[PDB]
Design a protein around this ligand. Structure first.
Ligand code: ZK8
Ligand code: ZK8
Lengths: 315, 315
């Protein structure tokens, strides 16, 4: 069932709870963010060297959107294939600094450029603000490819949990509005359905790092009181038509509330005739893709994600 | 639906049929083999350079089994991670020379050693002869790892169509007999069920390179008249228990009679808690993995398979 390394980390977390570490769901949103942001930074493996890191901003829909570009070791070409990466944290926590090590590694193994986006967070900017920025970021980089050292032909989106949701909504938004969408979508244990509780959401609601308590706390902040839970920007799995979506890589963990909706999305793409890789990492938890200081499986996962995307773009 | 490159190749094949090229199913097995073996060789992309090719043999269960080792460019280590590769051809056609380009490329992209096996073919050696060699080959290389420059910890099996079937049976055989099986299984559009006709087997029985006519012609030669079609060496999908099988990569083509049984096997592994990558290449046909002179998708497929296996073994 659980890998030894996964069991060991859940035990260390339980030890810290009994030790007197507060629950994230007990703190106010702004205070809990600062606290968890430092713990996330410290859970990622030591950041590898890349060719070049660039830090900048551009005009968003209703604020400045900050980004970080990562140029991989050994790639001298001007315009590189590019992954636009949306960090996770339930549209409330996380930022560019929390997913830095992961992004550096993706860049090096894929031989692609990675552009990490810093979208607006709830509760200060609730739904639909974080998705509006993610879409604004894709459009800005698509239409200014050369500014970002990006090859417009080979421009990909991706992310983890809420960032995975964001990546999936960006493709659906671009398809539904008739414009040029990404060339590839990388969904790391994404959130694709708010309308229903799957078997995994019920089964792994307690004691597997991402709990129901956490998900309610994010929900409190992200969603204005009376919203249709079946809105495709909250629940992209309920989309009517999956044709004309870009080729997809989808990853799930075994002990992740989100496993079943992750795999359902993959099934919807496969049956609609979209080129699609699907991988399940059983015996590990939500977060493992960036908990790489404690979880070796996370590093192997980054490498599988990077490798598949390099194979698609011929890097 | 069909990619332009797939449509173009099926049209050239149809042109040659109307042109007066005989059907493979009309020729005797030995004559058809010689004819198709030269066409296969000529359908593979130009063979890349590798560090070193070794050609040799060893004592099989009831004959000499020939093998070819491919050491990849840039890998100086004595003992490498190793893929034991079983060519396809319905246990009747194919050999080391037909899958040479593919094997060289897998070796280079994966950073792994590849060992191509030359197993006994039907009708001269019918069922269960080709599987007996495949199993004998794995055991010989496992128990003489250093002789073959193989790291025993990281010793993988794989193959395409009949070779895919063989790879899957080798893992089931090693599990059922209680011994140390492969550490990874790479199934390229494998044959996993003889007991039933799926939707894909009926839908793509005519006009997609691999036809029912071809499959009956292989079957005529491979299977002695009265065999239980539900024998796990013919139908490894009907296995009762999938626990204790190695992590798997499984690849299917959209227009492949074998798609549905390929995907079913993947589903069985995922539900049993085996780490498992599943990829569908829609808009291309059975054989595309080695028809790489005409089909660019085949080259992208080799790279995805190589990349996933490199990520697993940390090459
Ligand atoms: P994701 O954004 C999960 C939220 C899905 C529900 C949509 C409203 O959360 C992540 C992602 C990556 C790494 N960590 C976390 C995380 N860490 C600590 C506590 C909670 C979460 O969600
Ligand atoms: P595979 O071994 C398909 C046979 C599955 C049925 C089991 C008895 O056939 C292949 C594999 C790779 C490349 N080519 C071919 C092939 N080429 C030409 C004609 C027929 C076939 O099967």
């Amino acid at each position: 069932m659980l890998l030894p390394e996964t069991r060991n980390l859940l035990d260390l977390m339980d030890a810290a709870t009994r030790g007197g570490r507060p629950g994230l769901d007990t703190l106010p949103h702004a205070v809990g963010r600062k606290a968890v942001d430092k713990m996330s930074e410290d859970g990622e493996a030591d950041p590898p060297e890349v060719a070049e890191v660039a830090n900048g901003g551009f005009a968003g829909p209703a604020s400045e959107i900050r980004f970080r570009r990562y140029r991989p070791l050994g790639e001298a070409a001007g315009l590189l294939p590019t992954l636009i990466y949306y960090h996770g944290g339930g549209f409330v926590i996380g930022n560019i600094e929390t997913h830095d090590s992961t992004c550096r590694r993706l860049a090096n193994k894929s031989r692609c450029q990675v552009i990490s986006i810093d979208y607006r967070l709830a509760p200060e900017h609730p739904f639909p603000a974080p998705i509006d920025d993610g879409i604004a970021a894709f459009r800005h980089i698509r239409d200014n490819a050369e500014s970002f050292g990006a090859d417009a032909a080979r421009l990909a989106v991706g992310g983890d949990s809420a960032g995975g949701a964001m990546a999936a909504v960006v493709c659906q938004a671009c398809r539904d509005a008739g414009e040029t969408g990404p060339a590839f979508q990388m969904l790391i244990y994404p959130a694709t359905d708010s309308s229903r509780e799957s078997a995994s959401r019920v089964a792994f609601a307690e004691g597997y790092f991402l709990s129901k308590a956490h998900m309610d706390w994010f929900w409190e902040a992200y969603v204005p009181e009376d919203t249709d839970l079946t809105d495709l920007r909250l629940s992209p799995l309920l989309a009517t038509d999956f044709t004309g979506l870009p080729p997809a890589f989808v990853l799930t963990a075994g002990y992740d509330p989100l496993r079943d909706e992750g795999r359902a999305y993959a099934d919807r793409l496969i049956e609609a005739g979209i080129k699609t890789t699907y991988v399940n990492y059983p015996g590990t938890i939500h977060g493992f893709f960036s908990l790489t200081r404690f979880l070796s499986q996370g590093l192997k996962a980054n490498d599988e994600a990077a490798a598949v995307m390099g194979a698609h773009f011929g890097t």
